[PDB]
Amino acid sequence: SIKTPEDIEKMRVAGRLAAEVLEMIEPYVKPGVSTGELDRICNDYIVNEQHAVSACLGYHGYPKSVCISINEVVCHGIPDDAKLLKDGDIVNIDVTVIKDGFHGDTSKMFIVGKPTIMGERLCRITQESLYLALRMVKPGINLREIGAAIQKFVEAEGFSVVREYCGHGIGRGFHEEPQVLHYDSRETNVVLKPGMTFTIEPMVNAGKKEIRTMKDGWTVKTKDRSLSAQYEHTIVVTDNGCEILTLRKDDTIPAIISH
Numbered sequence: 245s246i247k248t249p250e251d252i253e254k255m256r257v258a259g260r261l262a263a264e265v266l267e268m269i270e271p272y273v274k275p276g277v278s279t280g281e282l283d284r285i286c287n288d289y290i291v292n293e294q295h296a297v298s299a300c301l302g303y304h305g306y307p308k309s310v311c312i313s314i315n316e317v318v319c320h321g322i323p324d325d326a327k328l329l330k331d332g333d334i335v336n337i338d339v340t341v342i343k344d345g346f347h348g349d350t351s352k353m354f355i356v357g358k359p360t361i362m363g364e365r366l367c368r369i370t371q372e373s374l375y376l377a378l379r380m381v382k383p384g385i386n387l388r389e390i391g392a393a394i395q396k397f398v399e400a401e402g403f404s405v406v407r408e409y410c411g412h413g414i415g416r417g418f419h420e421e422p423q424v425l426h427y428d429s430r431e432t433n434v435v436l437k438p439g440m441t442f443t444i445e446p447m448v449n450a451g452k453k454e455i456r457t458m459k460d461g462w463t464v465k466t467k468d469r470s471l472s473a474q475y476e477h478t479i480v481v482t483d484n485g486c487e488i489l490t491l492r493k494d495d496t497i498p499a500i501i502s503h
């Protein structure tokens with residue numbers, strides 16, 4: 245669907261709120277803190293300060309407000325008061341808020357304590373894969389091209405792209421069409437049009453692409469237990485490119501990408 249100027253404004257608000265949850269939580273992401281407390285901090289902020297709601301809680305039965313995944317956990321890590329962050333960890337906090345009917349969806353990696361060169365490299369490359377994709381977004385381009393570019397860049401780094409999950413259209417619905425694969429697929433045939441709003445959120449494994457879902461029916465880890473990183477932004481396709489609706493102060497890419 246093509247969002248209207250009004251809907252896009254609402255997406256800007258929702259996207260900014262999502263991004264600000266990530267900016268707000270940054271100081272709390274330090275050695276010793278539990279992912280459970282991080283989640284509570286994020287939820288209180290979303291509800292009490294942003295006057296918004298987490299779109300995650302309850303979705304497909306998800307128990308928490310945000311997803312927090314550490315190191316080998318690929319995605320959907322469930323915040324737990326007993327899971328503490330430690331020196332060297334790489335942690336993804338994935339946020340999605342609903343404000344005035346629209347969704348803002350974004351995530352980023354945080355390196356805890358003294359960074360490891362491997363962790364820093366995986367996160368940097370993963371973000372760069374998102375960035376290169378964002379720089380390709382504009383009317384007329386096929387999502388297949390973008391997915392192909394992400395995969396090519398990631399694999400060239402000796403990393404892999406997780407296939408079970410993809411980006412997605414977003415708006416009044418958390419996950420709307422189209423599906424945004426982060427790898428080349430013969431099934432992908434979607435030509436971008438102005439006003440389209442979707443996410444790009446590649447999950448990159450340091451090791452093999454295969455994953456394993458834990459027995460809590462949520463937590464996903466790399467099959468080989470290698471590190472996995474993910475970054476995500478919600479965007480709106482413009483006439484000559486795109487606008488990142490979930491940009492943060494620490495992002496090293498412009499909010500408005502012109503061509």
Ligand SMILES: O=C(O)c1ccc(-c2ccccc2C(F)(F)F)o1
Pocket residue numbers: 299300301302303304306311320338349412445476
């Ligand atoms: O960025 C996303 O699109 C995202 C993060 C987590 C999920 C998800 C996917 C399937 C079922 C439940 C959830 C959620 F509840 F954790 F949001 O979707």
Ligand SMILES: [Mn+2]
Pocket residue numbers: 338339340349350351445476
């Ligand atoms: Mn997300």
Ligand SMILES: [Mn+2]
Pocket residue numbers: 349411412443445476
């Ligand atoms: Mn998403």
Ligand code: NA
Pocket residue numbers: 313314315316317318319334336471472473
């Ligand atoms: Na991870």
